[PDB]
Design a binder for this molecule. Sequence first.
Ligand SMILES: Cc1cc2nc3c(=O)[nH]c(=O)nc-3n(C[C@H](O)[C@H](O)[C@H](O)COP(=O)(O)O)c2cc1C
Length: 362
Amino acid sequence: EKLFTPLKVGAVTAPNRVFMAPLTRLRSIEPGDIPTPLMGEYYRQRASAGLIISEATQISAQAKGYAGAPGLHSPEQIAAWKKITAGVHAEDGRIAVQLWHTGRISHSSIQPGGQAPVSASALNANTRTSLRDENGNAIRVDTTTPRALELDEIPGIVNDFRQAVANAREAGFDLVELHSAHGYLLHQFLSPSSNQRTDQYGGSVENRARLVLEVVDAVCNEWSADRIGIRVSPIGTFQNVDNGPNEEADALYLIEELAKRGIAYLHMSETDLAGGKPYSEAFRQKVRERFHGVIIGAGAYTAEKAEDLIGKGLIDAVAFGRDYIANPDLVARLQKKAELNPQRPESFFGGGAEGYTDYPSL
Ligand SMILES: Cc1cc2nc3c(=O)[nH]c(=O)nc-3n(C[C@H](O)[C@H](O)[C@H](O)COP(=O)(O)O)c2cc1C
């Protein structure tokens, strides 16, 4: 067994390879998109994870696409997150903040001024997002057609990521994870399906990856490369965003570029929740030889698969999502081969303590 052995992850050392995947739970306070004491308790319960990766967190107000998702742009958000990171650290844990801009997976009613959200191109996501009704309950609503970002707006987006990373450092996070996956803004630029731009930010893979690499460079400069991770979902289709007709070659291009920056980790979300083709070992070897930091695998992993791939030298750690929702002490349960608590999906999004902090430890 290697799941319970330490791993250096950039600036920190994880005591095990069982990571908590980023999980949107939509329990923040509105107005203000403010983390809560309840959220602090939830993360503190899970502090035995080798690394906690937070729920996706807005870099700016414009970044918002879901009612109840937190931000890391305002003073009140920074103050609230400081308490959460302090609670994890009090339990000897480590926590990364996942930073996103939702782009076109959003609704005008939660954008600044009630205006259309932004994207690479003016193409509707053709999906739904989660808003809140008059009683504060989560509801699903069709996405608003976005406005294409103007060329002169792109530096502002890069700056918002830079500033959110500075804020993350002050808030006490150990690392940041850039959300470059699952059809959100960075992936909207990466994918030919969502990017029809004819400037230097669309067309070729070099142009499509330009934004995310500008963001990586800005955040490495702001903090340090050994504090930066990135999540990608570059093989398959995710929330209607595919990866184009040359997905493998394009993925390897992006990974080679990321490696040049010497960042802490590469987190691969391998399949959508609705499933997808498995990664071949040949593709895993190609990824492995191109990236010199930690590789985290995710997507319906079992402990057995994690051990198999870690043992083969193809990945270093595994992020578990739904098992971490239901099992605060997942590390101890996997180590002891204990049964897991059953999942209650109806309370994954929104609500309060029920289905959030009420899954017992052993
Ligand atoms: C309720 C829920 C919320 C999620 N929120 C996020 C998120 O904020 N960021 C992200 O990158 N992935 C998100 N995902 C994907 C998970 O990080 C994870 O990759 C996925 O659940 C597959 O892993 P699992 O089979 O271990 O649950 C979410 C998944 C679920 C079920």
